[PDB]
Amino acid sequence: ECNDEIDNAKLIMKERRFTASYTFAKFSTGSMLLTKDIVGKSGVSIKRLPTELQRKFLFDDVYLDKEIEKVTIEARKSNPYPQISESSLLFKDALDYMEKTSSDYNLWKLSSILFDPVSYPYKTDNDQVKMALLKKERHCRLTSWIVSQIGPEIEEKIRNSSNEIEQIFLYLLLNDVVRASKLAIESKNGHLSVLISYLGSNDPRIRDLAELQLQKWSTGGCSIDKNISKIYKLLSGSPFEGLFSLKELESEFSWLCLLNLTLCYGQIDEYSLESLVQSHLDKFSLPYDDPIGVIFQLYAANENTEKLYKEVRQRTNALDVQFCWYLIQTLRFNGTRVFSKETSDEATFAFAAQLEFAQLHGHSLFVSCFLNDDKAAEDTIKRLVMREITLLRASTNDHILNRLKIPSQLIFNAQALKDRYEGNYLSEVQNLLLGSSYDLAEMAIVTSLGPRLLLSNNPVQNNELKTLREILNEFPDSERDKWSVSINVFEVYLKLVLDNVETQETIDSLISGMKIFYDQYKHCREVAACCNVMSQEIVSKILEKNNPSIGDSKAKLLELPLGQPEKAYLRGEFAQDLMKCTYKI
Amino acid sequence: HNELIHDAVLDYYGKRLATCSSDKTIKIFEVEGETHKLIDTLTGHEGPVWRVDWAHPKFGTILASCSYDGKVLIWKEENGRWSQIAVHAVHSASVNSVQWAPHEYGPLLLVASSDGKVSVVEFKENGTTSPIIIDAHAIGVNSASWAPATIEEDGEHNGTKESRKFVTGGADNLVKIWKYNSDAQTYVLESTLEGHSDWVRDVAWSPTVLLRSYLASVSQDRTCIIWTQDNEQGPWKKTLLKEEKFPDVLWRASWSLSGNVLALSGGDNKVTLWKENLEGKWEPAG
């Protein structure tokens, strides 16, 4: 037989279109994939690749604590679920967590200068002086910064050049204007000093110098050198589209250096800081694979961020999901550069996924809040609260996080869902009451675990039984007759027995109701055993206050269910009782 | 131990994991990644364990399991130990899938048989379900799952149209969704999306939506079609995860909890991870 089920197994697999090894691809709570193995359990030979995150600060909760005291959790009134709509984030909240040689440092630092104002310590006389100087300020800082980054490169070349003239040129691609002059005097060159004194300004006069001096030279002369005539092109206001093109200079000096040239000299005060970077793009575009270069392009292209974003994206561009998420949210809700309430949602999912897979649970919840769409914001909040809140209680900084403005109700209900799994039905019911779900918490004592304050209660003093009673005096009585129909049976029971409200009508009302009640939870576990206790108590309670000894209440005793000793006792006692009557002469 | 792990899922507290094997046992395990503490064994079925699933917490932690017997024998820990709390058998012909519905959809139990029939019942502790069946495909249903999320009917009466949506996948290369109707006999079929030349294998809907609903319909034609529903209620348009035949025999294709990160289990024991690219098409993240 055993050998002949090998063969059957094989046929069953082939006809149902299975072959080879079965592998799967179900995402776990760690979000790695578990594939078959020899010593194979659910997962073996993990074919999950490392997380795409590797930014310092994302693995630091020190970062996460800090960002609670920036922007603060809030929800719409449209959906009462978190849907953050203010920002109090800047691009100066991480700058020291990564190196200062790194492109990551450069990316966060640059963005605050570009898009956000760099304010003055005072307030100007007119607002066009306010605003003009504000942009010029951003620009000033930028221009020097670029020079520091490009620094070592230019310096290297200055060192390796042992020609005076050549060193003199190399300096001007920095802001070494000072010292450029200094070397020129010493090396017996007047001509270089004169042109150097004019650096740091551009004018219609200066344009005029550049075009004419070139024409007179390459006509009346025998013609000036290739690179001198290239300089004339930078000063007339078109070096790359100029008659001598500097586009060849990419091939020796970075796209940022090339950008530097137009930015310091050409079209400075005939342009705003915005339009000025754009002009350089029209003369020579920067490479698309630069993460940090793309930023300039976005600023420059103005509120055509969307259009460019899709274009650049379709021409090779790498950016981190942390970066896309943080950028789109801050700028829109600072009103410095508006974004759509759609590009924001795309970015919120992307970073939030990477964070779960990284094993960052606080981070992944925070991020998610900045989601827009009443449904979506809803959807997401629910899910991540539900799956465990033990790690929302892990520290005191995770307490202030989740308790800030994420409805208390959600916290309590999550606890109950976890508690169903634990077999913690006792605490379950309590947490459902608090999560404002009076009807749900009814179901957890009557459909999953009968009251332990009517089973394990001590009958001697009934101390646990009246805890049952008193905690329904702590639960709504302003809206009682909309959630009590299993709990109510408990209520009428408790008032009749505890407090001694023995009325014939009260007795009947409970018994007729309790027949139905018995008839759907005489087969639920625990609940069934508690019904028998209840019955023993009610029967006992009637003798104890005086048995009314009518036909109908005799009836009542048998209409409420009886146990094995009880049905035998009644028949036993009735003959003895008769005997006793006939006893005395 | 097991030389072959067919498929294996997790609960909704992420402390337990249930392994579908092929030696007829459902091994309940405790999830600690690669290592597991085997706590239980439930042998009691005929042939390969095709599918098991865990209940959404608010209708137990019930574990409904199907094998080649063509029956769902439901197990439930009553007393801290496994026993049989139910049995089903309205369709026998091998039950392929066996799913529990979202919290709002109820304790609905999705049965999908290879006789071209599909049951949809309710789990009761007082008993009674009304037997409602609707015919999906004709050559069988090799996987079934559950539609995204419940909708809202407005007006004065909610839960009218759409509502609980059932998504199936037969062996006749046809993938489509439903719309629970109450005014036209059987579930009025939506639109037949024929884009398959070999039998449909696994179907998963994305619990992450933007402005379109994603439906990864895998097939044995070595491609996965991604059905982008335009504006979520528009038509279903052709969007291709790969245009070409992979040299991998694809099986499952299940989405992540957040994100449109999709894992596709290749025949060479390599689970590629796909993200949507710079265009509307997909490129691998790994």
- Closest residue by Cα to residue B18 from B26, A190, A403, A557: B26
Nearest CA in chain B to A345: B210
Torsion A286-A288-A289-A294 (CA) sign: positive
Helices and strands of chain B, counted as H and E runs: 0, 24
Q: Which of B27, B115, B264, B271 to mutate to test the interface with A (most CBs of A within 10 A)?
A: B271
Q: A43 near A34, Cβ under 8 Å?
A: yes
The β-bridge partners of B63 are B54, B75
Provide the b/e sequence for A82-111 (b: ≥16 CB within 10 Å): bbbeebebebebbeebbeeeeebbbbbbbb
Phi, psi dihedrals of residue A546, rounded to the nearest 5°: 105, 120
Q: Which of A24, A317, A413 to mutate to test the interface with B (most CBs of B within 10 A)?
A: A24
Please state, in angstroms and rounded to a whole number, the distance separating the CA atoms of residues A575 and A559: 22
Provide the b/e sequence for A245-279 (b: ≥16 CB within 10 Å): ebeebeeebbbbbbbbbbbbbbbbeeeebeebbbb
Kindly give, in sequence order, each residue whose CB lies less than 8 Å from that of residue A163, ignoring residues fewer than 6 positions away: none
Residue with tokens 């209900």: A413
Please state, in angstroms and rounded to a whole number, the distance separating the CA atoms of residues A557 and A563: 12
What is the signed CA dihedral for A359, A365, A366, A369, rounded to 10 degrees? Answer: 150
Phi, psi dihedrals of residue A319, rounded to the nearest 5°: -155, 155
Between helix A374-386 and helix A408-422 the angle, nearest 10°, is 40
Q: A497 near A537, Cβ under 8 Å?
A: yes
Torsion A73-A75-A81-A84 (CA) sign: negative
What is the maximum alpha-carbon separation in chain A? 162
Q: Is B13 an interface residue toward A (CB < 8 Å)?
A: yes
Q: Do A440 and B10 touch (CB under 8 A)?
A: no
Please state, in angstroms and rounded to a whole number, the distance separating the CA atoms of residues A40 and B20: 12
Residues of chain A in contact with residue B265, where contact means CB-CB under 8 angstroms, are: 23-25, 33, 35
Q: Which of B5, B79, B224 to mutate to test the interface with A (most CBs of A within 10 A)?
A: B5
Query: Would you tell me how many other CB atoms lie within 10 Å of the CB of residue A523?
Result: 12
Please state, in angstroms and rounded to a whole number, the distance separating the CA atoms of residues A458 and A461: 6
Q: Is B128 an interface residue toward A (CB < 8 Å)?
A: no
Q: What is the resolution of this structure in A?
A: 8.1
- B159-167 long-range contacts, CB within 8 A, separation 24+: B164/B101, B164/B105, B164/B106, B164/B108, B166/B110, B166/B118, B166/B120, B166/B134, B166/B136, B167/B203, B167/B205, B167/B215
Which CATH number applies to B3-286? Answer: 2.130.10.10
Nearest CA in chain B to A355: B258
Nearest CA in chain A to B4: A36
Q: B273 near B256, Cβ under 8 Å?
A: no
Which residues numbered 147-186 in B keep a CB inside 8 Å of some CB on A? 149, 171
Please state, in angstroms and rounded to a whole number, the distance separating the CA atoms of residues A228 and A165: 11
CA A506 to chain CA centroid, nearest Å: 56
- A28-31 long-range contacts, CB within 8 A, separation 24+: A28/B10, A28/B14, A28/B31, A29/A387, A29/B10, A29/B14, A29/B31, A29/B257, A30/A357, A30/A359, A30/B33, A31/A356, A31/A357, A31/B256, A31/B257
Nearest 5°: CA angle at A506, between A502 and A508?
115
The β-bridge partners of B73 are B65, B87
What is the signed CA dihedral for A62, A67, A69, A73, rounded to 10 degrees? Answer: -130
A207: exposed, middle or buried (Cβ count in 10 Å: 0-12, 13-18, 19+): middle
- Closest residue by Cα to residue A243 from A259, A219, A273, A276: A219
Q: Do A37 and B5 touch (CB under 8 A)?
A: yes
B270, two tokens: 């390599």
Q: Is B253 an interface residue toward A (CB < 8 Å)?
A: yes
Kindly give, in sequence order, each residue whose CB lies less than 8 Å from that of residue A340, ignoring residues fewer than 6 positions away: A306
- DSSP string computed for B186-209: S------B---SS-EEEEEE-S--
Going from the C-alpha of B213 to that of each of A549, B113, B283, the distances in angstroms are 71, 26, 19
- Closest residue by Cα to residue B168 from B197, B200, B198, B191: B200
Please state, in angstroms and rounded to a whole number, the distance separating the CA atoms of residues B274 and A373: 25
Nearest CA in chain B to A354: B259
Residues of chain B in contact with residue A354, where contact means CB-CB under 8 angstroms, are: 259
Please state, in angstroms and rounded to a whole number, the distance separating the CA atoms of residues A177 and A264: 12
Q: Which of B1, B80, B142 sits opposite A39 (nearest CB)?
A: B1
Torsion A354-A356-A358-A363 (CA) sign: positive
- Closest residue by Cα to residue B109 from B185, B178, B49, B55: B55
DSSP state of A133: H
A58, two tokens: 């994302």
The β-bridge partners of B122 are B108
Q: Is B85 an interface residue toward A (CB < 8 Å)?
A: no
DSSP state of B91: S
Q: Which of A27, A342, A523 sits opposite B256 (nearest CB)?
A: A27
Kindly give, in sequence order, each residue whose CB lies less than 8 Å from that of residue B86, ignoring residues fewer than 6 positions away: B72, B73, B74, B76, B123
Kindly give, in sequence order, each residue whose CB lies less than 8 Å from that of residue A27, ignoring residues fewer than 6 positions away: A33, B254, B255, B256, B257, B261, B263
Residues of chain A in contact with residue B10, where contact means CB-CB under 8 angstroms, are: 26, 28-29, 42
Q: Do A42 and B5 touch (CB under 8 A)?
A: yes
CA distance between the termini of chain B: 30
The length of chain B, given as a count of residues: 286
CA distance B184 to chain A (A): 30
Please state, in angstroms and rounded to a whole number, the distance separating the CA atoms of residues A114 and A117: 8
Query: Would you tell me how many other CB atoms lie within 10 Å of the CB of residue B51?
Result: 22
Please state, in angstroms and rounded to a whole number, the distance separating the CA atoms of residues A165 and A185: 11
Query: Would you tell me how many other CB atoms lie within 10 Å of the CB of residue A302?
Result: 12
Please state, in angstroms and rounded to a whole number, the distance separating the CA atoms of residues A564 and A570: 11
Q: Do A22 and B6 touch (CB under 8 A)?
A: yes
Rg (C-alpha) for chain A, rounded Å, is 41
A405, two tokens: 């403005």
Residue with tokens 């204007």: A177
Please state, in angstroms and rounded to a whole number, the distance separating the CA atoms of residues A445 and A489: 13
User: CB-side exposure of B217: number of CA atoms within 13 Å?
Assistant: 33
Going from the C-alpha of A39 to that of each of A35, A42, B5, B15, B24, the distances in angstroms are 11, 10, 10, 20, 18
Nearest CA in chain A to B209: A376
Q: Which of B14, B211, B220 sits opposite A29 (nearest CB)?
A: B14
DSSP state of B222: S
A416: exposed, middle or buried (Cβ count in 10 Å: 0-12, 13-18, 19+): buried
Q: Which of A19, A24, A380 sits opposite B7 (nearest CB)?
A: A24
Please state, in angstroms and rounded to a whole number, the distance separating the CA atoms of residues A507 and A494: 12
Going from the C-alpha of B261 to that of each of A89, A357, B149, the distances in angstroms are 28, 11, 19
A490, two tokens: 């408990």
A459, two tokens: 């009958």
Q: Do A33 and B7 touch (CB under 8 A)?
A: no
Helices (H), A359-396: 361-369, 374-386
CA A298 to chain CA centroid, nearest Å: 25
Q: A77 near A67, Cβ under 8 Å?
A: no
The β-bridge partners of B84 are B75
Torsion A478-A424-A407-B101 (CA) sign: negative
Nearest CA in chain A to B14: A29
Is residue B20 within a helix (H) or strand (E), and if so which, with residue range? strand B16-20
Please state, in angstroms and rounded to a whole number, the distance separating the CA atoms of residues A223 and A478: 100
Nearest 5°: CA angle at B187, between B184 and B189?
105
Q: Are strands B224-228 and B82-87 parallel, antiparallel or unpaired?
A: unpaired
A vs B: CB pairs below 8 A: 197
Please state, in angstroms and rounded to a whole number, the distance separating the CA atoms of residues A299 and A158: 32
Please state, in angstroms and rounded to a whole number, the distance separating the CA atoms of residues B149 and A334: 34
DSSP state of B2: B
Q: A419 near A431, Cβ under 8 Å?
A: yes
Q: Is B189 an interface residue toward A (CB < 8 Å)?
A: no
- For the beta sheet containing B117-122, the strands, ordered from the edge strand earlier in sequence to the opposite edge, are B95-100, B108-113, B117-122, B132-135
What is the signed CA dihedral for A162, A166, A172, A176, rounded to 10 degrees? Answer: 20
Q: A31 near B257, Cβ under 8 Å?
A: yes
Q: Is B31 an interface residue toward A (CB < 8 Å)?
A: yes
Strand, coil or helix: what is B87? strand
Nearest CA in chain B to A316: B278
User: CB-side exposure of B258: number of CA atoms within 13 Å?
Assistant: 31
Please state, in angstroms and rounded to a whole number, the distance separating the CA atoms of residues B269 and A24: 9
Is residue B238 within a helix (H) or strand (E), and if so which, with residue range? strand B237-240
Instruction: Provide the residue ranges of all domains of chain B, joining segments of one domain with +.
Output: 3-286
A220, two tokens: 């009346």
B242, two tokens: 């790969």
Kindly give, in sequence order, each residue whose CB lies less than 8 Å from that of residue A214, ignoring residues fewer than 6 positions away: A224, A229, A232, A236
Nearest CA in chain B to A321: B259
- Closest residue by Cα to residue A536 from A446, A453, A454, A452: A454
Amino acid letter, residue B34: E
Amino acid letter, residue A289: D
Strand, coil or helix: what is B82? strand
A555, two tokens: 């009836």
Residue with tokens 């000072």: A178
Q: Which of A42, A352, A421 sits opposite B31 (nearest CB)?
A: A42
Q: Do B5 and A13 touch (CB under 8 A)?
A: no
Please state, in angstroms and rounded to a whole number, the distance separating the CA atoms of residues B223 and B244: 7
Q: Is B93 an interface residue toward A (CB < 8 Å)?
A: no
User: CB-side exposure of A110: number of CA atoms within 13 Å?
Assistant: 22
Q: A150 near A254, Cβ under 8 Å?
A: yes
Q: Do B5 and A46 touch (CB under 8 A)?
A: no
Please state, in angstroms and rounded to a whole number, the distance separating the CA atoms of residues A255 and B65: 62
Residues of chain A in contact with residue B2, where contact means CB-CB under 8 angstroms, are: 40-41
Nearest CA in chain A to B34: A43
Q: B205 near B149, Cβ under 8 Å?
A: no
Residue with tokens 């575009």: A285
CA distance A195 to chain B (A): 48
Nearest CA in chain A to B58: A417
A202: exposed, middle or buried (Cβ count in 10 Å: 0-12, 13-18, 19+): buried
Q: Do B249 and A19 touch (CB under 8 A)?
A: yes
Q: A46 near A34, Cβ under 8 Å?
A: yes
Please state, in angstroms and rounded to a whole number, the distance separating the CA atoms of residues A28 and A43: 10
Q: Is B252 an interface residue toward A (CB < 8 Å)?
A: yes
Q: Do B57 and A368 touch (CB under 8 A)?
A: no
Rg (C-alpha) for chain B, rounded Å, is 19
Q: Is B259 an interface residue toward A (CB < 8 Å)?
A: yes
- DSSP string computed for A458-504: -TTT-TTHHHHHHTSSSS-SSSGGGT-SSHHHHHHHHHHHTTT---H
